[PDB]
Subunit: 373 residues, 4 copies
């Protein structure tokens, strides 16, 4: 039981000085008068912090608690434990020293001005559970305005894993990338990014579907906020609801709500339809019910079913490789991670991508992101 | 050597997972779905974070690098390695998980608005190496506006230790507290606070001395910035330079520059003069030369010679006791630690206070600060 | 629940390395070719293994499983988790790196020959849960034959704590030490030593009681093996069973089995009878029942009720102080530890000794054992 | 400077408790009475120790100091620091909790009887720097007599890495395995095992060469001790010195002394001769001098040259995979490790095998050894 095992532990984070015992000598070196010469050093040249501090291995897990898991805007106090969670995964899978920073400030322009000032302390930032659409502007501004890498799982993380899964499934489907119809349901924090990736990779006919049906420039009803996606998708200028968009569709990438895709609409999709029902905790459609309705491949966000698509397969490596290469996170480094993950296994219907525990993946990703631009 | 060591180590900060291996099981309790309930738990009652997360044992070492050691305003990059030093000391002597936070923002009203937003992540704050006189307003505002304890070594840490040193020396001097003349040279971050403490403890005739001589309301020349010390000190309405202030003076507490106290001025100070030459690296006057010129007791900031006066004897305990008792840092708590330290040894000319390594001290301070208001 | 949490942690002991992430340079120093020069220095003077290795802070927790807690001779496999438990306490309360070593060999002359061979690896040995009377010969020989300190809690550790508890209770009873009658039930590993301590301290009329009643030279029935206690105790040449020995008795120190002291026999003991029912898991008599039957002070080995008497108060400090002073464990050190614990609180009926969590105790003991002979 | 750094760290290893602050609830589960339940459980079934104790991840680094590095029989005190070295590499590359055990006992029958008794505490044993020929009998008896895996680097470790190197070089040489002539110089701890492996793999004409020249049954001069190698090698019944054995030879695997192979003898070897000069610190022949004399491929034990053949590429994985699969170390598991290492790169003259830092290798080895018999 979760709750008990927490109060027991009293936190999932800890520190630990390198040395075992301290005496007149140790101070003289790790502190004044000794460390004085490390300041002179790091001040005269900042890169030196990556050689004398932990800076080369530290990452800040920043959240305001505006979109904690599937709970909503519960706040920073409720997000704290979830951020120690991410901090743990960072240490466990990338040996990164991640420190959870939960801010009590929701105004986007201030979140940005606050994090920018943290740069001297970390080698990278990891925006976590920050609501949409403000997470879009925050991510963009920060990655541009800061010299250390800035990543946001729910957005870029998801997009990386999904693309990988997509690529492998596409191979098994044997269809041409520039000829398949992919329906993306739920254009939120993940949705938005997922579309752009599919476009980048090479998909041509992508149809965005949200609360108001197919996103179409023409029907401004569907164009809720300035997120644009309608102008770069839906080439057959389609129009209608989800059921309408699934006609002849080859892939369904749902990242919205549960039980909204009716088993019978699957038979209206082209041969061998791929179904990514990544909604938590309840998937767009039950995995088993989809196999029965005629799904060639099925994937969810849950662990109790085959083909789990979760960021864990992408952020440990990406973040480590970018924080070491001391560089910003570029589309090239993200695409390499997509390829990295994808080739980290031989694809098969019940295994299109590896599990987060395959330590080979994290090395392949760390390797790619590192060597990438 | 300092630099070689820091390079080899590659940081003085690390993190530790509580569990060794991590399997599907573990990540179900420490992260989704189990972490989901602790979110609700702390969201409904913020105080639960003290039970399920490390909030109870975590402290932030905040600095903007505006007053790093005796180097001046070298910046946050230069301050980073010195803050990792403080974080080390916190783990070593108080088993506290201290995380160094160097901000790249110097404007006081913004340092304040940024730190206030970190509350959800820490159980205590420790302002370090932040220059004067902006550190005064920052310290004040923060301790007032935040719910977790806020401390600043250079200001408060120093004053506590010095006070203890004073109390013991005064006992050996056998003179009455409300009748001794104390010359405090250098009214800076440490100076300011030291004076107020002496006053709180009971000293009556305190004489502040700075770059422009004895601080006196009348000669506004001496009143550099708004730090007021002139209005609460110097009762005999004296006036002049340092040498003028030492006439009949019983104690000299220097926390300014080196070799500024002439050995011959000492013979002009009352019987059995106490000399605290706490300036680094060079003491106001040489320790040996002072014994020679007629000094009953001598103390410096260095371990170079006997009686070392350094914050380390104070911050480990204070900070721990306060962060646990989840309370702000009060003048009562502070005074308890003064006594705490003072009575943690039997005073003698070459040993007025214990060394930082006397574990017994940190327990007496932790105990005092804890039980105090 | 205990079995729950034990599986989750997959152990109660891990290891840390000074460096976070290794590389070429590092190994060249911490291993071939560099390390070859530390080897040469340790071959040179074996006494330098305290300057270059962990020897200075390592302790082996040796057991054969012949007397694990109150379960008996369950074996080494059963003892292992209990020896990780004593290894944890060492780290928690003495910051000692204790490694649990459970031998699968019961023959005393071999246990001795195996442990003697471990000397080069440890700076101290801690014999745990080894049955009597072989634990006597083993402890003796080893302390004599090895250069590092050898200790055995449930002989020496127990005697130290009990004695401290005794002294404080004796003060509250205000009786004279050289005039009280102390009944010691269970002349085993702990029993044996407890008697000798009481004698050393100054008690004159001590009555040893075991399976065959009062130990009396005359009745060889009671003199099971060569442990002698009958020749140095029982001055009033008494004889009979437990109930017989409790007549006029001022103290009862039981360290045998549960529910063997009948509540009514307590009213046959002098005024204000002290009852130490240190048997685990079930105390010689119920704590509550004894208060009711007229017990002035009550103490058990269990944590449940008040006044808990357990080694923990005892071995962390002793072991640390002796391993640092690189000396054998002498009766003076042990006696120092007795006093140390006793004066670490102001005695009172419901608090004759502090709890294991009082970090002040472990420091006072460490301090004592260190300065002692 | 290794020395100063070892003296700074005062230990390359440390323990560390999962939890952080110990409260009266922690002991109830980790110690008494909680532990008790675990004790009984583990006693009931020994294999339960692999789930309630850190036995599943612990390994003992056992040595008597009879063959420490290239220093000789310097003793256990001199070996201690070198064993902490191996202990460090175990944690750094396999996250294994290795504890260094240096025995002060040189008689083989006692080393064996001592180690056998340690089984309850470890999940595996790692015999290190124990001289030959006693290391042969010790290794054999122990692996047979104990249930946990027993490994000895210098013997089995070396043979694994060498075979890997061999296989890749053979591929680049394009000759047939059952048709090449391999000269193995120095039939010691490594030599012995290396021969047997080459035979197992498939080499037919292997010529053993030692201090007395080619090992030949007929010339008993060459047959120093009972190590047999002469009866299973040298089919062309050759006879003579090293220079004699190199005639028409395809491979030279030297694991003896330095500068003993004359550059000109290389031209008497078949086309494209492979030269493994694994002697430390000085190789049988200089690497560069060999390239110049006509060597197709060259490898040494040293790091300053291409193709380094060192156990580090084999023991972290083997040991981890065998300690988890709770099984003895079999020839099948060793052979899989050979293949594993070999296929962990695409072979090339200046890179026939990867470096120890290629974390991919350690996973491939861990994977192989695990899945193997
Ligand atoms: N990408 C991942 O690794 C991952 C992991 C776990 C869960 N998820 C799932 O991702 C989704 C949340 O994404 P955010 O990106 O975190 O969400 P979000 O709140 O930013 O966006 C969700 C989108 O869903 C739309 N939506 C709701 N109901 C719909 C319906 N019936 N038809 C069409 N659109 C609908 C909303 O209008 C919104 O645009 C959830 O389904 C969540 O459980 C993703
Ligand atoms: N408190 C401690 O534990 C400790 C330990 C080591 C060194 N020090 C010394 O304390 C001083 C730092 O104080 P802060 O208060 O930390 O620094 P600060 O810069 O805030 O204040 C120092 C004050 O010294 C004044 N000053 C300069 N020359 C003077 C003179 N001749 N006479 C009187 N005042 C003079 C400055 O104008 C300033 O107000 C330094 O000299 C430093 O090396 C203190
Ligand atoms: N396998 C590895 O990973 C590794 C790593 C570093 C060093 N080494 C080297 O391995 C050798 C030591 O092996 P052990 O197996 O550790 O050694 P060992 O002492 O057990 O055996 C060494 C053998 O060398 C023989 N020898 C000495 N000089 C010779 C000569 N001129 N011609 C023929 N034989 C000769 C000896 O008679 C002996 O049989 C050394 O060369 C050592 O530096 C091996
Ligand atoms: Zn015990």
């Amino acid at each position: 039981d979760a709750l008990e095992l927490h109060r027991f532990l009293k936190g999932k984070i800890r520190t630990a000085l390198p040395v075992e015992k301290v005496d007149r000598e140790t101070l003289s070196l790790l502190y004044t008068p000794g460390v004085a010469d490390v300041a002179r050093a790091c001040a005269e040249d900042p890169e030196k912090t990556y050689v004398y501090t932990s800076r080369w291995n530290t990452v800040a897990v920043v959240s305001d608690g505006s979109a904690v898991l599937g709970l909503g805007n519960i706040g920073p106090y409720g997000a704290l434990p979830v951020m120690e969670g991410k901090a743990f995964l960072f240490k466990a899978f990338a040996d990164i020293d991640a420190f959870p920073i939960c801010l009590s400030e929701s105004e986007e322009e201030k979140i940005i001005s606050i994090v920018k000032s943290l740069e001297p302390s970390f080698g990278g930032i990891n925006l976590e559970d920050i609501g949409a659409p403000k997470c879009f502007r925050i991510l963009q501004r920060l990655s541009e305005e800061m010299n250390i890498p800035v990543f946001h799982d729910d957005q870029q993380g998801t997009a990386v894993v999904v693309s990988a899964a997509f690529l492998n499934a596409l191979k098994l489907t044997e269809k041409k990338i520039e000829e398949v119809k992919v329906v993306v349901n739920g254009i939120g924090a993940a949705g938005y990014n997922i579309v752009k990736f599919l476009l980048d990779l090479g998909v041509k006919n992508v149809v965005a579907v949200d609360r108001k049906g197919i996103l179409n420039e023409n029907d401004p009803e569907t164009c809720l906020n300035e997120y644009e996606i309608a102008r770069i998708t839906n080439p057959e200028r389609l129009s209608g609801d989800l059921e309408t968009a699934l006609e002849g569709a080859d892939f369904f990438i749902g990242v919205s709500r549960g039980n909204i895709l009716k088993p019978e609409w699957i038979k209206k999709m082209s041969r061998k339809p791929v179904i990514f029902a990544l909604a938590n905790p309840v998937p767009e459609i039950d995995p088993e019910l989809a196999r029965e309705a005629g799904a060639f491949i099925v994937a969810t966000g849950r662990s109790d079913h085959p083909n789990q698509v979760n960021n864990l397969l992408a952020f440990p490596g990406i973040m480590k490789g970018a924080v070491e290469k001391r560089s910003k996170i570029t589309k090239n480094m993200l695409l390499s991670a997509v390829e990295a993950i994808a080739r980290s296994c031989e694809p098969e219907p019940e295994r299109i991508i590896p599990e987060a525990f395959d330590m080979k993946v994290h090395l392949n990703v760390y390797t790619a992101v590192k060597g990438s631009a």
